[PDB]
Amino acid sequence: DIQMTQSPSSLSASVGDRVTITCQASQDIRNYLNWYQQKPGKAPKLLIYDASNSETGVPSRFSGSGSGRDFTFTISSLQPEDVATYYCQQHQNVPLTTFGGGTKVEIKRTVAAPSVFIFPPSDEQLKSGTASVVCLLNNFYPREAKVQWKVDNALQSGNSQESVTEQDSKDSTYSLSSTLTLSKADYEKHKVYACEVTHQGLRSPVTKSFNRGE
Amino acid sequence: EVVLVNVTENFNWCKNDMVEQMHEDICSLWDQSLKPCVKLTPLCVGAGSCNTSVITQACPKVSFEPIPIHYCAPAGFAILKCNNKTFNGTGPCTNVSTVQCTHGIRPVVSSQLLLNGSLAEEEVVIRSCNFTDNAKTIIVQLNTSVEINCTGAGHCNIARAKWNNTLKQIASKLREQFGNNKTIIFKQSSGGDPEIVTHWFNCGGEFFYCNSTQLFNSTWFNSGSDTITLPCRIKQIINMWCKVGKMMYAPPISGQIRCSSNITGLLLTRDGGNSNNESEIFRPGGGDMRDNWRSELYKYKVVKIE
Amino acid sequence: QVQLVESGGGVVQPGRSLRLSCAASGFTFRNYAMHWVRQAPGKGLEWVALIKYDGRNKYYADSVKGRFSISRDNSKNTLYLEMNSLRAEDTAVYYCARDIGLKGEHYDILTAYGPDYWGQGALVTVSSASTKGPSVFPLAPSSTSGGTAALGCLVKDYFPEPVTVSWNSGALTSGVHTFPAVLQSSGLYSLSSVVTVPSSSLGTQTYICNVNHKPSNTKVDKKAEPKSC
Ligand SMILES: *[C@@H]1O[C@H](CO)[C@@H](O)[C@H](O)[C@H]1NC(C)=O
Ligand SMILES: *[C@@H]1O[C@H](CO)[C@@H](O)[C@H](O)[C@H]1NC(C)=O
Ligand SMILES: *[C@@H]1O[C@H](CO)[C@@H](O)[C@H](O)[C@H]1NC(C)=O
Ligand SMILES: *[C@@H]1O[C@H](CO)[C@@H](O)[C@H](O)[C@H]1NC(C)=O
Ligand SMILES: *[C@@H]1O[C@H](CO)[C@@H](O)[C@H](O)[C@H]1NC(C)=O
Ligand SMILES: *[C@@H]1O[C@H](CO)[C@@H](O)[C@H](O)[C@H]1NC(C)=O
Ligand SMILES: *[C@@H]1O[C@H](CO)[C@@H](O)[C@H](O)[C@H]1NC(C)=O
Ligand SMILES: *[C@@H]1O[C@H](CO)[C@@H](O)[C@H](O)[C@H]1NC(C)=O
Ligand SMILES: *[C@@H]1O[C@H](CO)[C@@H](O)[C@H](O)[C@H]1NC(C)=O
Ligand SMILES: *[C@@H]1O[C@H](CO)[C@@H](O)[C@H](O)[C@H]1NC(C)=O
Ligand SMILES: *[C@@H]1O[C@H](CO)[C@@H](O)[C@H](O)[C@H]1NC(C)=O
Ligand SMILES: *[C@@H]1O[C@H](CO)[C@@H](O)[C@H](O)[C@H]1NC(C)=O
Ligand SMILES: *[C@@H]1O[C@H](CO)[C@@H](O)[C@H](O)[C@H]1NC(C)=O
Ligand SMILES: *[C@@H]1O[C@H](CO)[C@@H](O)[C@H](O)[C@H]1NC(C)=O
Ligand SMILES: *[C@@H]1O[C@H](CO)[C@@H](O)[C@H](O)[C@H]1NC(C)=O
Ligand SMILES: *[C@@H]1O[C@H](CO)[C@@H](O)[C@H](O)[C@H]1NC(C)=O
C-alpha cells in the first residue's frame, strides 16, 4: 500500500512567481502519477497525467517532471486564478492514493482595507421572534480581522458567528460575514447596534452602526 | 445433413439465443498436436558421388492446438442452417438445411480483429444489427484471410500489401452501404480501457495488447515498409481462465501455444454527428464478446421438431 | 462535451443504505472504466471504488470494503454506487470520475490510469436529524456612500447542506459573495449572499435572489429593495 507525501503543505507567493510543489512516493511508481487542481467548492480538474504530460486545454504555465519516487509540479508564472489546492495521485496500483489535504496555494498581494457594511433584521424575520444583525467586510487583505459587536455600547460574546470566503480568483482578496443573533425580546431592549472592525489597512478601527426606527 | 428443398425460412441473428448460451458456457480447449515430418539428406561424402540418402524423422516439437467446439441441438429440437452464401442474418433464407450440430468453432477472446474464424465464401460481407444506429458494432467478414505473426517478444507482423488490399475491399463494401459516393476513412480508437483501445486477444493464458494504430489510419475514394510491426504488451490474466464449478482450467504455458493466427474479420464502429461531408469515419470496435459469437452463429437457429 | 451528473444525494440515518447514480454523456460510456471518489468536509480526496469498462472487474478501498458495491448499466449510460451500514465517517461529497483511456503516452497495461473528468458531486449526509427547508430574509440597501452600495439575502435555518444562491436567475455575477454556511447551536445551518452595486442603479435594476435547497424541494426567489416608511 503506497503512501504519498507532498510538500509544502501550504504556501504564499506573489503574482508572477514560480511555484514548485514536490510529491514523493513510499516506493517506485515509474511515472504513473497525476496532478489535480481543486478550487474551493468545485470538483477537481486534471492538469498533468503520467508525470509530465499536459492535459488538453490546460494553460501552458502548468508543467510536471519526475519519475521513480520523486516528482515536481510547477506553475511558471502564478496567476490570481491559480489559487487552489493541488493533489498528486499515484496509479501504479489500486488503491489510488494521494496526500491527505494536498497543497494549498495562496496569493500574497498588497494590503487592502475592507469596505464595511451593516444590516438590521428584516421586518419579515422579526415577526417570527428572532433578530439577525449582519456585518459584512468586503474585499480585504490579509485574511486576519477582528469583528466586534456592541449593543448600547455593550461588547457582546457567544451570540456571534462568522464565516470567511476563500481567496477571490480575480483580485486575491477575502470577505467576511459576521452575524449577531438575539431573541426578538432582547433586540427590542436596546437601541444602538454597532459593528467595530480592526484590520491592517485601517488607520484605526472602523464602526458602522444604526438604531431601531430608521 | 438434410436439405429442406423449396423451403423459405426467416432468421434473426440478433434475436438468437445460441449466441447467449455459448457466450455463457463455452471455454477454450487445447490438445497436444504432432506435426511430424521427414528429412531427406544426400550422403555425398568424398568425393562427389551420392548414391545414398539418409532418411530422418524430425519436427518433434509438440504444441497445443485449439479443439473445435460444436453446439448441438437438444433432443426434440434441430438447427436450421442458412446456405445462402451471402446471408445478412435477417429475413428470408430461400435455401435451408437441417443439421444436428454447428460447424466447429475455435473460440478466441478478442477486440478489433476476429481471428481463426470462418471466411465469406464469395465476397466480403459486412453486417450489423442496425446500420443506422452508429452505436451498433459492424461485423466484417473477409473472403481471404490476412496472416498475422505474433511472438512472445511482444510484436505482431502483417504484410502491408495484404492489409492494404483488405482495407480497399472493406471500404468498397462500406461505400456500398453508406453512399456509393462517399470518402471512407479509418482512424484509431477514441479512447477507453486497454482491452478496447488496442488489438486485444488471448493466446492460452496470456493476453496480447497490440498497438493497432498503424492498421487503422487511411483515407479511401478521395481523388512504405513491406511489413507492419505492431508493438505488444503481454499480461497473464487468471480471472479469465475457465472456471467450471470448483475446478479451474489453466491453459498451456507461453511456449506451448502458437500466438500467430489468421484474421478472418474485423469489428468496427461508425461515427456520428451526421456530417453530410459525404464521408464516413470508422474505428476498431469490440469489448462485447457477443459480437464475436454472432460472427459465427449468424446462419443458425434452433427450432422444435414436429 | 464530456458530462457526468451525480444524483441521489441527501440525508440518511446511521445503519441505513443509499444508492447514488451518475448519468454519463458526451463519450462512449461502455468503453471507459469509472471511479468513485469521496471528500469529507474540508478534508482530502479519498478514492473509494473502481469498475472496469465491462462492469466485471471491481475494486474497493479497504475502508468501504464489504459495505459498498459498485456497478454500471452500459445500456442506460449510468454508474451506480450502493452504500450499506453507513456511519458518521461516510458523510461526504461523492464524485464520479471517468478514468483516462489508454493514451498514446502510456506504455504499459495497468489496472487504472487515473481520472480525467469529474462530476460536480453529490453530498451524502449521515444523520438522524430531519430535513428542514430554509427561510429567506432580505438584506436592504442604505443611505463611499454615494459611490457603491451593498445588498443581499440571508438563507437561515436549514438542513442538510447544500443551498444554491444566484442573482437575477444567474445574470448578475460580478461582486457576488456567497459565504460558507455556519452550523448554528440549533443544529441548523445559515449563510449569506451579498452583491455590491453602484448606489445609482437601484430602483431600475431588479435583484432576484434565486435560493435553492433541493434536499427539501425549497425553491425561493426573493427581492432586495431599499427600506422606506
Ligand atoms: C421447388 O421449386 C422449384 C422452382 O419453383 C420447382 O421447379 C420444383 O418443382 C419444386 N420442388 C421440387 C424440388 O420438385
Ligand atoms: C553408387 O556409388 C558408386 C561409386 O560412387 C557408383 O559407381 C554407382 O553408380 C552408385 N550407384 C547408384 C545407385 O547409382
Ligand atoms: C442450397 O444449398 C446447398 C448447400 O449444399 C447448395 O448445394 C445449393 O447450391 C444451394 N441452392 C442452389 C442455388 O441450388
Ligand atoms: C442471400 O441473401 C441476401 C440477403 O441477405 C440476398 O440479397 C441474396 O439474393 C441471397 N442469395 C441467394 C438467394 O442465394
Ligand atoms: C437482409 O436481407 C434481406 C433479404 O434476405 C433483405 O430483405 C433485408 O432488407 C436485409 N436486412 C438487413 C439487416 O439489412
Ligand atoms: C473477395 O471479395 C472481393 C469483393 O469484396 C472480390 O473482389 C474478390 O475477388 C474476392 N476474392 C476471392 C478470393 O473470392
Ligand atoms: C435503427 O437505428 C436507427 C437510428 O437510431 C433508429 O432510428 C431505428 O429505430 C432503428 N431501427 C430498428 C429496426 O431498430
Ligand atoms: C508469417 O509467418 C509465415 C511463416 O510461418 C510467413 O510465410 C509469412 O511471411 C509471415 N508473415 C509476415 C508478413 O511476416
Ligand atoms: C495499397 O497500399 C500501398 C502501400 O502498401 C498504398 O500506398 C496504396 O495507396 C494502396 N493502393 C491502393 C489499392 O489504393
Ligand atoms: C463523387 O465521387 C467522387 C469520387 O469518385 C468524389 O471525389 C466526389 O467528391 C463525389 N462528388 C460529390 C461531392 O457529390
Ligand atoms: C498514419 O498515416 C499517415 C499518412 O496518412 C502516416 O504518415 C503515419 O505514419 C501513420 N500513422 C502511424 C503509422 O502511426
Ligand atoms: C478528401 O479528404 C480530405 C480530408 O482527408 C477532405 O478535406 C476533402 O474534402 C475530401 N475530398 C472529397 C472527395 O470529398
Ligand atoms: C489460430 O489457429 C492456429 C491453428 O489453427 C493456432 O495454432 C493458434 O493458436 C490460433 N491463434 C490464436 C490467437 O488462438
Ligand atoms: C492461416 O491460414 C493458413 C491457410 O490459409 C494456414 O496454412 C496457416 O497455418 C494459418 N496461420 C497460422 C499461423 O495459424
Ligand atoms: C464537410 O461538410 C460540410 C457540409 O455538411 C461542409 O460545409 C464542410 O465544408 C465540409 N468540410 C470539409 C471541407 O472537410
Ligand atoms: C501506438 O503507436 C502509434 C504510432 O507509433 C502512436 O502514435 C500512439 O501513441 C500509440 N497508441 C497508443 C494507444 O498507445
A104 forms bridges with which residues in the sheet? A10, A85
Q: Does residue B198 sit at the C interface (CB-CB below 8 Å)?
A: yes
Residue type, B255: G
Ligand positioned closest to the Cα atom of B114? 13
Tell me the three cell numbers of residue C3: 458530462
Which residue owns the Cα nearest ligand 7 atom 11?
A: B130
Residue that is last in its domain, among C128, C151, C183: C128
Segments forming the whole domain that contains residue A116:
109-212
On whether both C99 and C152 belong to a single domain, the answer is: no
Q: Is the CB of C2 under 6 A from ligand 16?
A: no
Here the CATH number for the domain that contains residue A78 is 2.60.40.10
On whether both C182 and C220 belong to a single domain, the answer is: yes
Task: Determine the residue of B164, B183, B184, B220 to mutate for testing ligand 9's pocket, defined as the one with the most ligand atoms within 8 A of the Cβ atom.
Answer: B164
Residues with CB under 6 A from ligand 13: B 65-66, 108, 115-116, 201, 203, 257-259, 261
For residues A5 and A37, what is the distance between their CA atoms, to the nearest angstrom? Answer: 16
Question: CA nearest B171: which of B295, B268, B292?
Answer: B268
A142 prior amide bond cis, ω within 30: yes
For residues A71 and B13, what is the distance between their CA atoms, to the nearest angstrom? Answer: 54
On whether both A83 and A123 belong to a single domain, the answer is: no
Closest chain C residue to the Cα of A42, Cα to Cα: C120
Span from the CA of B285 to the centroid of ligand 14 (angstroms): 24
On whether both A96 and A115 belong to a single domain, the answer is: no
Here the CATH number for the domain that contains residue B115 is 2.170.40.20
For residues B142 and B119, what is the distance between their CA atoms, to the nearest angstrom? Answer: 6
The label of the residue with cell 452501404 reads: B177
On whether both C57 and C135 belong to a single domain, the answer is: no
Q: Does residue C182 sit at the B interface (CB-CB below 8 Å)?
A: no
C72's CB contacts (< 8 A; 6+ apart) are C29, C34, C51, C55, C78, C79, C80
| Strand-pair category, B183-186 with B243-244 | unpaired
Residue that is last in its domain, among A108, A128, A144: A108
For residues B238 and B205, what is the distance between their CA atoms, to the nearest angstrom? Answer: 7
Residue that is last in its domain, among C128, C151, C174: C128
Residue type, A102: G
For chain B, the first-to-last Cα distance in angstroms comes to 17
On whether both A18 and A63 belong to a single domain, the answer is: yes
Contact C120, C178 (CB under 8 A): no
Q: How far is C143 from chain A (nearest CA, A)?
A: 11
Which residue owns the Cα nearest ligand 13 atom 11?
A: B261
Here the CATH number for the domain that contains residue C84 is 2.60.40.10
The ligand 8 atom nearest the CA atom of B159: 13
Span from the CA of B61 to the centroid of ligand 10 (angstroms): 55
On whether both C2 and C114 belong to a single domain, the answer is: yes
Closest chain B residue to the Cα of C58, Cα to Cα: B239
For residues B275 and B164, what is the distance between their CA atoms, to the nearest angstrom? Answer: 26
Span from the CA of B295 to the centroid of ligand 16 (angstroms): 28
A59's CB contacts (< 8 A; 6+ apart) are none
Closest chain C residue to the Cα of B198, Cα to Cα: C102
Segments forming the whole domain that contains residue B116:
1-306
From C61, C144, C191, residue closest to A95, measured CB to CB: C61
For residues B219 and B211, what is the distance between their CA atoms, to the nearest angstrom? Answer: 19
Chain A positions in Cβ-Cβ contact with residue C105 (cut-off 8 Å): 49-50, 53
Segments forming the whole domain that contains residue C213:
129-229
Q: Do C109 and B233 touch (CB under 8 A)?
A: yes
Residue that is last in its domain, among C99, C128, C157: C128
Q: Which of residues 70-99 of C touch B (CB under 8 A)?
A: 99
Task: Give chain B's domain count.
Answer: 1
Closest chain B residue to the Cα of C107, Cα to Cα: B233
The ligand 7 atom nearest the CA atom of B135: 5
Tell me the three cell numbers of residue B43: 550422403
Q: Does residue C105 sit at the B interface (CB-CB below 8 Å)?
A: no
Residue that is last in its domain, among A58, A92, A108: A108
Per-residue burial over C97-136, b = 16 or more CB atoms within 10 Å of its CB, e = otherwise: bbbbbbeeebeebbbbbbbbbbbebbbbbbbeeebbbbbb
Span from the CA of B164 to the centroid of ligand 9 (angstroms): 6
Q: Side by side, which strands form the sheet with C18-25? A: C3-7, C18-25, C78-83, C68-73
Q: Is the CB of B261 under 6 A from ligand 14?
A: yes
Question: CA nearest B33: which of B56, B67, B58?
Answer: B67
On whether both A95 and A121 belong to a single domain, the answer is: no
Span from the CA of A122 to the centroid of ligand 11 (angstroms): 70
CA dihedral B137, B262, B205, C98 (to 10 degrees): -30
Taking the mean position of all CA atoms in its chain, how far away is CA B242?
A: 20
DSSP H/E element including A186: helix A184-187
Q: CB burial class (10 A; 0-12, 13-18, 19+) of residue C55? A: middle
Task: Provide DSSP, C163-199.
Answer: -EEEEGGGTB-TTEEEPPPEE-TTS-EEEEEEEEEET
Q: Is the CB of B164 under 6 A from ligand 9?
A: yes
Q: Is the CB of B176 under 6 A from ligand 6?
A: no
CA angle B134, C27, C37 (to 5 degrees): 150
Task: Give chain C's domain count.
Answer: 2
Contact A119, C140 (CB under 8 A): yes
On whether both C133 and C211 belong to a single domain, the answer is: yes
On whether both C71 and C111 belong to a single domain, the answer is: yes
A85's CB contacts (< 8 A; 6+ apart) are A37, A38, A101, A102, A103, A104, A105
For residues B12 and A178, what is the distance between their CA atoms, to the nearest angstrom? Answer: 71
Tell me the three cell numbers of residue A28: 517506485
Question: CA nearest A189: which of A159, A212, A157, A210?
Answer: A212
Q: Does residue C2 sit at the B interface (CB-CB below 8 Å)?
A: no
Phi, psi of A99 (to 5 degrees): -100, 120
User: DSSP code of A120?
Assistant: P
On whether both C109 and C168 belong to a single domain, the answer is: no
The ligand 5 atom nearest the CA atom of B130: 13
Chains that touch A (3 or more CB pairs under 8 A): C
On whether both C209 and C115 belong to a single domain, the answer is: no
The ligand 5 atom nearest the CA atom of B88: 1
On whether both C9 and C120 belong to a single domain, the answer is: yes
Chain A positions in Cβ-Cβ contact with residue C192 (cut-off 8 Å): 134, 136, 163, 177, 179
For residues B116 and B142, what is the distance between their CA atoms, to the nearest angstrom? Answer: 12
Task: Give chain A's domain count.
Answer: 2
Closest chain A residue to the Cα of C181, Cα to Cα: A163
Span from the CA of B136 to the centroid of ligand 1 (angstroms): 39
Q: Which of residues 212-241 of B touch C (CB under 8 A)?
A: 213, 233, 235, 239
A136's CB contacts (< 8 A; 6+ apart) are A116, A117, A118, A119, A175, A176, A177, C150, C152, C192, C194
For residues B264 and B262, what is the distance between their CA atoms, to the nearest angstrom? Answer: 6
On whether both C38 and C54 belong to a single domain, the answer is: yes
On whether both A71 and A126 belong to a single domain, the answer is: no
Contact A99, A63 (CB under 8 A): no
On whether both A131 and A174 belong to a single domain, the answer is: yes
Task: Provide DSSP, B145-202.
Answer: EEEEEEETTTEEEEEHHHHHHHHHHHHHHHHHHH-SS-EEEE-------HHHHTEEEE
User: DSSP code of B289?
Assistant: H
On whether both A9 and A95 belong to a single domain, the answer is: yes
Span from the CA of B259 to the centroid of ligand 4 (angstroms): 36
From C31, C107, C110, residue closest to B287, measured CB to CB: C31
Ramachandran area for residue B213 (φ above 0: left; ψ -120 to 50: alpha; else beta): alpha
Q: Is the CB of B237 under 6 A from ligand 9?
A: no
B275's CB contacts (< 8 A; 6+ apart) are none
Q: Is the CB of B275 under 6 A from ligand 15?
A: yes
The ligand 10 atom nearest the CA atom of B223: 7
